[PDB]
Structures are given as C-alpha cells and as structure tokens.
Amino acid sequence: LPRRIIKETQRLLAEPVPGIKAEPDESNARYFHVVIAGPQDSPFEGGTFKLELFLPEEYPMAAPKVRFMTKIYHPNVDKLGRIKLDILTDQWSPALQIRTVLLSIQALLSAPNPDDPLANDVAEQWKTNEAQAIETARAWTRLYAMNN
Amino acid sequence: GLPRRIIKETQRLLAEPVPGIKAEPDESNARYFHVVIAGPQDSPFEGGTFKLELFLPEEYPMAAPKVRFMTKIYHPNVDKLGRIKLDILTDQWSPALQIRTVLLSIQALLSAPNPDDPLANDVAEQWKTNEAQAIETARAWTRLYAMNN
Amino acid sequence: QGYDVEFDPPLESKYECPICLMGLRSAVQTPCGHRFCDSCIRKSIRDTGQKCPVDNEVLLEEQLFPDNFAKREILSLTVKCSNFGCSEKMELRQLEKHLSQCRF
Amino acid sequence: QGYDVEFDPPLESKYECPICLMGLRSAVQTPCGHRFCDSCIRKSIRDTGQKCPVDNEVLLEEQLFPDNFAKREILSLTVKCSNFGCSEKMELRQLEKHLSQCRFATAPCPQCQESVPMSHLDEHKSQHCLQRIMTCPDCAGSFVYAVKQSHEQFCPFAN
Amino acid sequence: MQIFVKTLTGKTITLEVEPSDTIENVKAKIQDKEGIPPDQQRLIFAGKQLEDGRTLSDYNIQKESTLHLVLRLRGG
Amino acid sequence: MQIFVKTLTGKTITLEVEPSDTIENVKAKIQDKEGIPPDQQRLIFAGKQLEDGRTLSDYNIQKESTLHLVLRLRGG
Ligand SMILES: [K+]
Ligand SMILES: [Zn+2]
Ligand SMILES: [Zn+2]
Ligand SMILES: [Zn+2]
Ligand SMILES: [Zn+2]
Ligand SMILES: [Zn+2]
Ligand SMILES: [Zn+2]
Ligand SMILES: [Zn+2]
C-alpha cells in the first residue's frame, strides 16, 4: 500500500481543509469518499457534493481518477460527473496530491468556465444567458445537493 | 580595503590558536606576520622555539603566502636564507588553504624531514648517508639557536 | 523510491522529495532550483513530461545535476532502526550496516 | 567578493565560501560537491588552475552549476544594518531596500554635498545649509543663502 | 500580520504582510522563498481563486489565515 | 570516540571512532562528511603527519583531541 499514499493520507487527515472531507474506504485504501462544499459567493452556496476519487496503480506518476457522484449544473462537468480540469484532464504533476486536486475542484466551482467547456449545452447557456444558467445552477444545487 | 578574508582569518588565529603555533600581525603592516612554531614532539627539534616571518602578497589568497625561517635550523628542506622547500608554497597552491594550514605544514615538516627533495644539499647529503650524526647536530642547532629568545 | 526511514529529529522539508515524500536518495537539483530523487524526477520526465513538477517550467534529462552537497547532509542526519524493539540511533549512512547485524 | 554583512545568528559554514570566507553571492556547486561564489571560483579557475580548491579534483568553467536552492536559503538569513545606530534586523534579501531608508544612515546633500543623517536632512532646509534658498523677509525674493550680500542692493521696492 | 501558506508539497511557510499588500506582492514573497514564479502560482483561500490586482483586505484575510498554493489554471 | 577534525576552510567536525581504528578508516569518515577523497587528505596532530597503516592509539589520540586536515600534491 505504497508509502507516498500513506503519508499523504495521514497528512490530510490531520490537516483537513475548510469544507473538504476525504476519507479512504475501509476495504480499498486507494478509494476516497469525498465531499466538497459549495464555495463562498458561488452559484452553489450551501451545497454538499459527493465525489468518487481513486488512486491508480501508476499514482503518483499519473493523475487520480475523479467523478462527481452528485448532479451539478456546471459547464466543466458533464451529466456523468466527468470533469474537465487541467490537473487530471491532461498535464499533471507527481508533486500534486489529493489535497491540491480537491482544492482545484473547489476552485472550479468558484470559477465556472464556458470558454473551456465539457458540458457543451450548459456552457452555451452560461455564455449567452449567464443569469438563467446561474439560477439553474442554484436550482440544481437545492434539488440534489442538500440532506444526502 | 583590508580584504575581509585576511581580517576574518587574522582574528581566528588569535582566538583559536593552533597548539604550538603563534601568529600575530605586525603593528605596522597587517599582511606581515610574526610567527613562532614549536619544535614538535619526539622530533630532532623538541624544546625548540623557531621564529618565522610570513607575508601576504596582494594576490592572496589567489597566490600563496611567502614565509621564511628567521631562526637557524639544521634541516634538509630549509636553506641558510630560511627559505622552505615545501610544496604548498611552491606550485599547485590553493586559495582554500589558509595561514593556519601553511604553518601546520611547516610544523609537520620539522617532524618529517625529506632528504630526497632537498634545498640544503650539504645537510640532506649528511641526512641520507649518516642520519644519526645529522639528527644529533639537528638537536644541537635547535639547542644553540632555538632556545631563550 | 526515496529513503523510507524514521528520521530523528524528523526529516525537514528541504531534504524531502516533492514526488515521493521521503529523504532524497541520490538527490538531484534543477536549474529551476529545486530537488528530487534522481530516480523520481527522471520518471517524472519519462511520463508526466519535460517539465519541473513544482513549477510547470522547462526541464530535460540533460540539465538535472546531482546536489552532492545535499546528499551528504542527508546521510549525516541521525535515524532510528526499523526492526521491532531496536531503539538504536545512528547516522543514516550506516543503517544498512546495522540492519545486517540487527537484533529483530 | 561574497556577501559581506553581519549575520545574526552568525553564518553557518555550509553557506561560507572557502575562498573569500563570506555568505555565498550567486552560489555555485561543483560536481565534486563544493560550494563557492561564482565570481570567486571562476577566478580560482583563472589563476590557480582547473581544479576544485578543497578536494584536488578536476574542474572547469562549464561543469559548475548554480545552487539556487542554497542561494535562496542564504537570502532568508537574518542580518543587521551596517549603519551606526541602526539596532534593527531583517532578511539579507531586503538589506538594500532598508539602507535606502535606514533611520541612522548617512546621505550626502543635494545642495551642499556635505554628508548628513537622514533624520536631519528634513531639518536641513529651514536651518540653512549654505546653498539653501532663502526668501527675503520684507521684500519677497528668491535667492541662495550664499549670495545674500548682493541682494541687499535690491530692497528699494518702488510702489 | 503573519499568514500561513501551504505549498504543493504540503509543508507550511509563514509570511509577514499587511492587509494593504496586493496578491501580486504575496506571490512575489512566495517566489523569494520557493522559487515558483508569480505566473505559475494560484492561491486559493476559502475556496476562492485570488486575483493579482486586488488586495488581502478585498478578500478580508486575517492574521493566522492559511492560503493554499496550487498550479496555474491552464484549462484543456 | 567523538574526535574533532579541522578541515581546510576552518570548519570543526566531530567523528565517532574507537581507539583501535586505523587512520585509513578515519580518512574514510572525513570523505563521507566532507567529500575529500582519502588520497588527497593529510592528517596532522601535535606536528606529526599521521600514516595510513597505524592506528589512533599508536599515536596516543584520546577523547576530544583535534586532528587537523590539510592538502596533498607534495614533493615539489
Ligand atoms: K541546505
Ligand atoms: Zn523521490
Ligand atoms: Zn536494530
Ligand atoms: Zn567567495
Ligand atoms: Zn570538490
Ligand atoms: Zn537601519
Ligand atoms: Zn545642504
Ligand atoms: Zn530684499
């Protein structure tokens, strides 16, 4: 259960970040049940979004596998919960850790990007009709991301 | 401009003296050093106190210090003029080396004379062919010239 | 792949590898100006690409150099045994010497 | 050529240049594992020969590299101001910035090029520094305190 | 005020600043201690991506606050 | 045990030994700490060059005694 992972685990278990919860499964030490909170001044205020994070055999030399297991109206996140994020989408660094990944996911919620989209339909509405797209983001937050 | 190197080295020589090596700058010139080294243990020169004079050229530490014995010493690697045949001072000098390391090597040289790379040829010849006589004269030269000064 | 061992006092961040998170085995430094294990950074240039992991700056097999200065310093840190009831302390350098003649 | 400056705590020998015996200015490490100031070692290659001064290994202009990790830790070392009454500490990095506005520093005059403490260069307009520009009391004309004697020609203010 | 920052590796640096310091300055003072150029830094605080022009007081950062450093948002 | 050694530059290091150690392996402990290979080291004590064959107790070295290290390229 390689050393890099173990140290990194107990490092973020002792230094938990505001509104990010990440715990390994009792069974598999590489599978992390994650919840990130809707950030300050975001469309997703008061929201609690679950995530399935997993460390591949390659790690840390390759990026982790990450999905949103809660539905969220967001131009960089598709209907399957797959995520368009620089870190684990493409150019990755083995310096990076779970901590930094999860922060960057949080940072994605703070800055939705229609100009670098995955959900092509959402980003279209997000660019031309910001107001409504934000209201729908809030509505999806309220329907899916509370009391779960 | 009395380059920090020299200064830093100078106040360490006074504060952390090497056993049986005294080195103080002249009251006039900071680069000129009155030195006294002790005739080391179990040597020909034991009981001796030898005055030397060490000078730092303006190149220092990119060139070696120039040092000579002022005291008379029967030794194959020290001539009548007190110049010393020691590598440190000749070629392949290093600017990492310091006055301490020069003087320590001169102290060492007194314990371990070298007839094979001579300067006083008459002495070295004596030292190779008739070592016991040369060594006994060495203790006498020590005795006459390197005590009570 | 870095030095996995109980350091005491515990390993300071400057000798820790950003990639593996352990004592810098055969440490190498970038011209960028940071440190990694020779093995670890070389794997980062194999797979993650020609970049410094900590800056996203240019980095090639060629311009890595060994921080030999750092490597001693590291081997001079005192460490404990890793077999059960040992509790002997030593400079890291002779951990392998002692674990040949160790108790448990 | 290195960093000549009072460190407190005093400089640990690991950042000391074995040639000049100071804090490593633009620090460079050798392949044999040696720390020098770029300038110093490059002179040691010029005049002493192509070798590391400490272990007698082979060395050249090319194969030395800048120890950027060591240089930054160097500039983080706390140091004291080098003007007289300073009594203050800072990281080596901002010694230069602090010497601009040292409370106890000495600054030559814009007008008199007599050196003057920074505290008192403020007070060196009202109390005349010898080329300071007086305003005539009871006639209102600008002239340099040097040249008063000749302005006493011109206080015959018509109407 | 002294404020905490967590670099990529996870270890914690502490920096002396005042509230009228720009983020620009914080990244410059991070560069001096970690060698990461200002371009290549992204500071996150309370899940908010901090912008260069604005100040610490504009995001109301206080004494003993922990910034988190990550790498540049170069979306792809 | 725990002897002192003054390197070329002035640094004073400490080396754990036992009296029956050779000068050879002392010169090895210098190399590990200071990078200078044994061939280029010369060790001095009370004005004597210490020889590679003999032991520390053969020169009457003891607790806390300071050896001095200098350089080679001799016979010139
Ligand atoms: K260091
Ligand atoms: Zn590593
Ligand atoms: Zn053991
Ligand atoms: Zn230097
Ligand atoms: Zn070397
Ligand atoms: Zn001051
Ligand atoms: Zn004036
Ligand atoms: Zn007038």
Residue numbers in the entry:
A (entry chain B): 4 to 151
B (entry chain E): 3 to 151
C (entry chain A): 55 to 158
D (entry chain D): 55 to 213
E (entry chain C), F (entry chain F): 1 to 76
What does the published report state?
One E3 ligase with a critical role in many immune signalling pathways is TNF receptor-associated factor 6 (TRAF6). TRAF6 preferentially builds Lys63-linked ubiquitin chains by virtue of its interaction with the Ubc13-Uev1A (also called Ube2N-Ube2V1) E2 complex following engagement of receptors. To identify the essential features that regulate ubiquitin chain assembly by TRAF6 we have determined structures of the RING and ZF domains of TRAF6 bound to the Ubc13~Ub conjugate in two crystal forms at 3.4 and 3.9 Å. Both structures show that the Ubc13~Ub conjugate contacts both protomers of the TRAF6 dimer.
In an attempt to improve crystal quality, we expressed and purified the equivalent RZ3 construct from Danio rerio TRAF6 (DrRZ3). The sequence of the RING domain and first ZF are highly conserved between DrRZ3 and HsRZ3, and together with Ubc13 and Uev1A, DrRZ3 and HsRZ3 promoted the comparable synthesis of ubiquitin chains. Additionally, DrRZ3 formed a stable complex with the Ubc13~Ub conjugate that could be crystallised and diffracted to 3.9 Å. In the structure, each asymmetric unit contains a single TRAF6 RZ3 dimer bound to two Ubc13~Ub conjugate molecules. The central RING dimer is very similar to the previously reported HsTRAF6 RZ3 dimer structure, and an overlay of the RING domains (residues 62–122) has a main-chain RMSD of 1.0 Å. The contacts between the conjugate and TRAF6 are comparable on both sides of the dimer, but the structure is asymmetric because there is no density for ZF2 and ZF3 in one molecule of TRAF6. There was no evidence of any proteolysis, and a large solvent channel occupies the space where ZF2 and ZF3 are expected, suggesting that the two missing ZFs are highly mobile in the absence of any crystal contacts. The α-carbons of the two symmetrical RZ1 complexes overlay with an RMSD of 0.4 Å, and both are similar to the RZ3 complex, with an RMSD of 0.9 and 1.5 Å. The contacts between proteins are very similar in all TRAF6 complexes and provide a molecular basis for understanding TRAF6 function. Because the conjugate contacts both RINGs in the dimer, this structure accounts for the absolute dependence of ubiquitin chain assembly on TRAF RING dimerisation.
